[PDB]
Amino acid sequence: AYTNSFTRGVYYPDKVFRSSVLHSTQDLFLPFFSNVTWFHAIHKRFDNPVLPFNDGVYFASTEKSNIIRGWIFGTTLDSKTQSLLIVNNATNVVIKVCEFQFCNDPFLGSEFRVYSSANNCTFEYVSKNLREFVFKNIDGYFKIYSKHTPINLVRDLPQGFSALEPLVDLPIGINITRFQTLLALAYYVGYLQPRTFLLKYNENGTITDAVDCALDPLSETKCTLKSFTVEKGIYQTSNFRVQPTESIVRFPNITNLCPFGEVFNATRFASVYAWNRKRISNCVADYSVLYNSASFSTFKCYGVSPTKLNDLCFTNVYADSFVIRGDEVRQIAPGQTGKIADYNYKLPDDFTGCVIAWNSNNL
Amino acid sequence: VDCTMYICGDSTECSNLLLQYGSFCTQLNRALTGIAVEQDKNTQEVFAQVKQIYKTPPIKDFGGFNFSQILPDPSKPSKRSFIEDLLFNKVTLADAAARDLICAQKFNGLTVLPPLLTDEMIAQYTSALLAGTITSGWTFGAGAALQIPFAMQMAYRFNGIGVTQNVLYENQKLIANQFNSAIGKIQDSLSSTASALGKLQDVVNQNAQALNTLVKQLSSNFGAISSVLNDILSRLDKVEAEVQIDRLITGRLQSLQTYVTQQLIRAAEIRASANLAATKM
Amino acid sequence: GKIQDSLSSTASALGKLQDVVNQNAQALNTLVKQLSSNFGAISSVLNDILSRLDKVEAEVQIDRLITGRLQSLQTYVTQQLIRAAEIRASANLAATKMSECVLGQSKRVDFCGKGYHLMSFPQSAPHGVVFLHVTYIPAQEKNFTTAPAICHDGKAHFPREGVFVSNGTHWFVTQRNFYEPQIITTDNTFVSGNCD
Amino acid sequence: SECVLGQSKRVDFCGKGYHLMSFPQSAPHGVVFLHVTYIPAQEKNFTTA
Amino acid sequence: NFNFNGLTGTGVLTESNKKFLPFQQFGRDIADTTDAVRDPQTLEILDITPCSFGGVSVITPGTNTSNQVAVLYQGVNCTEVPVAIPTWRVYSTGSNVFQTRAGCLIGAEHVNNSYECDIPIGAGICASYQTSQSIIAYTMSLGAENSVAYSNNSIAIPTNFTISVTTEILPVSMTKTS
Amino acid sequence: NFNFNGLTGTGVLTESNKKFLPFQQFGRDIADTTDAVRDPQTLEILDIT
Numbered sequence A: 001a002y003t004n005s006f007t008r009g010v011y012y013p014d015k016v017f018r019s020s021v022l023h024s025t026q027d028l029f030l031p032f033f034s035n036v037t038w039f040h041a042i043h044k045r046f047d048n049p050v051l052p053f054n055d056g057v058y059f060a061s062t063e064k065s066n067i068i069r070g071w072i073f074g075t076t077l078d079s080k081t082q083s084l085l086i087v088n089n090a091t092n093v094v095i096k097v098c099e100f101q102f103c104n105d106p107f108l109g110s111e112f113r114v115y116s117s118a119n120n121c122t123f124e125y126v127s128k129n130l131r132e133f134v135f136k137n138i139d140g141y142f143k144i145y146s147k148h149t150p151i152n153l154v155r156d157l158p159q160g161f162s163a164l165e166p167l168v169d170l171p172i173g174i175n176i177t178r179f180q181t182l183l184a185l186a187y188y189v190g191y192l193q194p195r196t197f198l199l200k201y202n203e204n205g206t207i208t209d210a211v212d213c214a215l216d217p218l219s220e221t222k223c224t225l226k227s228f229t230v231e232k233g234i235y236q237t238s239n240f241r242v243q244p245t246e247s248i249v250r251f252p253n254i255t256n257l258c259p260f261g262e263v264f265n266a267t268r269f270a271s272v273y274a275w276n277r278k279r280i281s282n283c284v285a286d287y288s289v290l291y292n293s294a295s296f297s298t299f300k301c302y303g304v305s306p307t308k309l310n311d312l313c314f315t316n317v318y319a320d321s322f323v324i325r326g327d328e329v330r331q332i333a334p335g336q337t338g339k340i341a342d343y344n345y346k347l348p349d350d351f352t353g354c355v356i357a358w359n360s361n362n363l
Numbered sequence B: 001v002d003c004t005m006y007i008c009g010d011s012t013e014c015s016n017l018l019l020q021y022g023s024f025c026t027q028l029n030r031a032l033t034g035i036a037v038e039q040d041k042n043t044q045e046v047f048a049q050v051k052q053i054y055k056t057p058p059i060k061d062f063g064g065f066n067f068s069q070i071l072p073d074p075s076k077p078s079k080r081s082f083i084e085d086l087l088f089n090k091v092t093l094a095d096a097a098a099r100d101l102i103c104a105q106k107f108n109g110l111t112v113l114p115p116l117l118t119d120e121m122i123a124q125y126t127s128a129l130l131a132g133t134i135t136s137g138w139t140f141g142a143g144a145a146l147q148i149p150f151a152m153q154m155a156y157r158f159n160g161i162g163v164t165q166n167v168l169y170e171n172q173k174l175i176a177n178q179f180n181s182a183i184g185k186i187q188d189s190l191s192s193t194a195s196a197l198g199k200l201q202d203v204v205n206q207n208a209q210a211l212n213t214l215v216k217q218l219s220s221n222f223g224a225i226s227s228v229l230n231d232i233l234s235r236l237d238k239v240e241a242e243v244q245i246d247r248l249i250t251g252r253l254q255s256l257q258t259y260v261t262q263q264l265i266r267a268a269e270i271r272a273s274a275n276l277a278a279t280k281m
Numbered sequence C: 001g002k003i004q005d006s007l008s009s010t011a012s013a014l015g016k017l018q019d020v021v022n023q024n025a026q027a028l029n030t031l032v033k034q035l036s037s038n039f040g041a042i043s044s045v046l047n048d049i050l051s052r053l054d055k056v057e058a059e060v061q062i063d064r065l066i067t068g069r070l071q072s073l074q075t076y077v078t079q080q081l082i083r084a085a086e087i088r089a090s091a092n093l094a095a096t097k098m099s100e101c102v103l104g105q106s107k108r109v110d111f112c113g114k115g116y117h118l119m120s121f122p123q124s125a126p127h128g129v130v131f132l133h134v135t136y137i138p139a140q141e142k143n144f145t146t147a148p149a150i151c152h153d154g155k156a157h158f159p160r161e162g163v164f165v166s167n168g169t170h171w172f173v174t175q176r177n178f179y180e181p182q183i184i185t186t187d188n189t190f191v192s193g194n195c196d
Numbered sequence D: 001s002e003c004v005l006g007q008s009k010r011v012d013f014c015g016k017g018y019h020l021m022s023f024p025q026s027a028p029h030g031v032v033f034l035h036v037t038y039i040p041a042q043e044k045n046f047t048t049a
Numbered sequence E: 001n002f003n004f005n006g007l008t009g010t011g012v013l014t015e016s017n018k019k020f021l022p023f024q025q026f027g028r029d030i031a032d033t034t035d036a037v038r039d040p041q042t043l044e045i046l047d048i049t050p051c052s053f054g055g056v057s058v059i060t061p062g063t064n065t066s067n068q069v070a071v072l073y074q075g076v077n078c079t080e081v082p083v084a085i086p087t088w089r090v091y092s093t094g095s096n097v098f099q100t101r102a103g104c105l106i107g108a109e110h111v112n113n114s115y116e117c118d119i120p121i122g123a124g125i126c127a128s129y130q131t132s133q134s135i136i137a138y139t140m141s142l143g144a145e146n147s148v149a150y151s152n153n154s155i156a157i158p159t160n161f162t163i164s165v166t167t168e169i170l171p172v173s174m175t176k177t178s
Numbered sequence F: 001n002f003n004f005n006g007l008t009g010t011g012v013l014t015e016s017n018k019k020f021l022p023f024q025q026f027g028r029d030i031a032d033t034t035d036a037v038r039d040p041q042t043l044e045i046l047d048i049t
Ligand SMILES: *[C@@H]1O[C@H](CO[C@@H]2O[C@@H](C)[C@@H](O)[C@@H](O)[C@@H]2O)[C@@H](O[C@@H]2O[C@H](CO)[C@@H](O)[C@H](O)[C@H]2NC(C)=O)[C@H](O)[C@H]1NC(C)=O
Pocket: C141, C142, C143, C144, C145, E147, E148, E149, E150, E153, E154, E155
């Protein structure tokens, strides 16, 4: 089942007091009038399976008997990784981050049947109705916002505006990609997206209104004018710009593999005063084989990234090889000087190649 | 000119860096927007000085004065006068290659907005002003168009210069013949040489020169390993690409700041010319 | 009375003065907000850098802020110098209208409002001046037959001032800008030449 | 054009008082106008109707 | 997106009429963008022009009056607007689409009446919120059209007058920042 | 000079009437520039004038 998020899910983006002002912020928000999923848990739809977490979750409950009691968050949910438990028991809110082996169908009831075991626990804390929440993992923390509000309704998420205040800021490093609700023997889930919001702060510094700057052209005018009221006119809000339908790749259709093997694994190298040069051309290369070889003590590229080197084409390539002292490798760079750089092998100031060197004391 | 689309083209990577310079691109877009709206205001205050679109009568007995070169030509879709065609041609023989260049150069985020009033509308206002004058004297300026015979309008004009009006009426045929010949010399002069209209063709050449400079500034390196920003994105990983891109951003942004500053100054020069043209009207 | 009522009611009349306030306040706010821009430094709060980095690295980050903040002042002052030139032009115009419309009566058409100028009264406004241009507008025109001259006794008579008009049976002379007919008379006409 | 080549009725354009005539004088990077003007003086009161 | 021999960009690859000489590989724009390219496998020549773009200018009455708006996609043809932009496809699917010379106008009702220019658009087009209200778009009327009734012996003379008072406003100063 | 929770600068600390919300630690002017701070021990609000 589904329903519409009537401007719900705004939250105070940072711990800074502001008043009598309109402020633009870019953050993960629930887009206005989003298509949110609706669930009918009661002590009827009891199954209430695991859900993805994505970039972050908005959660709300319409309730009368405190049936909804918490959530678990994690990836594998099977003790092969750490996971986060949040639960509100009859006397305390409890938060723990352990390698939980959760039950196949976690519930409360006199009963607590959430997990079979917990180990390697690295964080713990112990502390008619609409209850609203937002959950984020960001910048090395797990962050939670909430508000509770009185209602009188039989079904569906109510209208009107209410900004969620920050609740807790857990310094926990775990990965999260899925979550599931914990229930005691209706709720709504929405997903956050990166959005630009204009927030209206009253004289007491509460957020009393917001504009989702992307929602529609009028909202974008409001946002680009930094004003909730817009006078009659024509306003140059934005750029229309057609996105690419697909990506076309057209490299040359040459099948001949480049003979890099015979320059790196040669039996005898040339004397540096008479450094050898081999032209590499009319062939297809695979620089990833060289870079990932891990056999080289030094691998320095100038004007070309080693990883992107495999995603590029060249008109010609020249492989130069020679042997020098380990202390002389530092001279094989653009703009260098010394007996080797001055009298044996000089690189140009604007060199565009790569320098690769390895210890050969075995040969 | 869109500041972000000029500086970064398609690149999202460059666009994210350009946000760290903050407001500069919003200032440049907004300054050019002001200049653009100024041009309609300049046109409005020169030509929309007449409240009503006055018409000449079909029976054009103006006492021997022959305005046929300067009154609208009904045979044409734009319905310019004959002299307004000679004017329109000699400047559009420049431009009004630059448009075609700018259209080719549009790939770099240039755009040219149409004016609010078309050539047809401006010629419709000059028609109303001219038809008002010859039929009603200065009176259509001060208020309602009070018709008066043109021979007697011209006799008022003579009193204004301190020549008694009988000098008009006793020499009206000579005075009309002199006028008709002088209008002929105007027609010949504009048909003969474009060089009279140099003031209009110069502002066209200056705006064309400013954009062709602004386009060529994309070809600069500003010290970056390539002028073509897509090369860097194809060739360096982010930690090194950012240093190269930031050189292009800096130099391309200073190219816009120079252009927008000089166009703000030219906008004041043209507005001073428009204020004069409005006062002459 | 209509001036008082209009200024009491419409918002758009004083647009030029409010706009000048808007543009200058907007420029200041924009100049302040450019202090929050990083220009590639690790922070735009300059005290962060000097607490967080050692000197020879800090100088690299600080010089980015100095470059971008100096570029922000050059942008502000450049645009204020251009705006100052615009205000100078309005000030020279307002001074000329004080000279010619207030201290005088201007023959210049549409310079001191629509209609023929009678007089103007200056009123001060925030950062500006308001001229109440009092003007005469011809109204309720009637049509007449007219002629350049009267032929009498074989000689042509022309008006000394005004214009000849006929109501269809009688010929009169009258002033051009207000119908007050008078008998065509040797006192208000002058002769020149024969009628032919 | 207006003060030297003509007589200007434009108040306070060609100096104070009623403009009679003006003389141009050259100066470094500029021009100097000597505006000659009639200023009325020694007024007396009268009854009027 | 295209990537020829590593030369990478975005555009609408098109069969070129431009006759490259047999050795030539790229064709260049004055700004060093790629004007044309040779396919490395068929050796055919392709024109490249960029995917279209333009200013989204949003036309609105005051929010005090209405939340209706119209959108002018400046400089782009209406047949190309609906696909992409940050996305409001429900506008492009509306019944109101109208090709001005300024660009595609969406969400305004074109009418054949003419009025004074309320909101300017360009090329003689203006738009207004009018009646059941909608944003209409129309060619602006320059003024009432009048025949002066001239004749070689007719004069009009005012029998009366109006004393008019006209407010003119001029800026004189701006705030003395330092 | 002041350091509040790392917020380092110079100003005239003044007793505020601006009612921070309980979670808020700092306060800013309309310009998004620092204007007040919550003392981390007394929890009172100071105008950083
Ligand atoms: C002024 O008169 C014109 C027509 O002039 C006629 O000849 C004059 C010498 C005098 O004898 C007038 O009484 C005559 O009528 C009027 O023009 C008409 O205006 C109406 C619109 O109001 C228009 O529909 C007609 O086509 C016009 N007629 C012509 C021939 O152009 C005009 O209305 C008169 N104005 C006033 C204020 O009385």
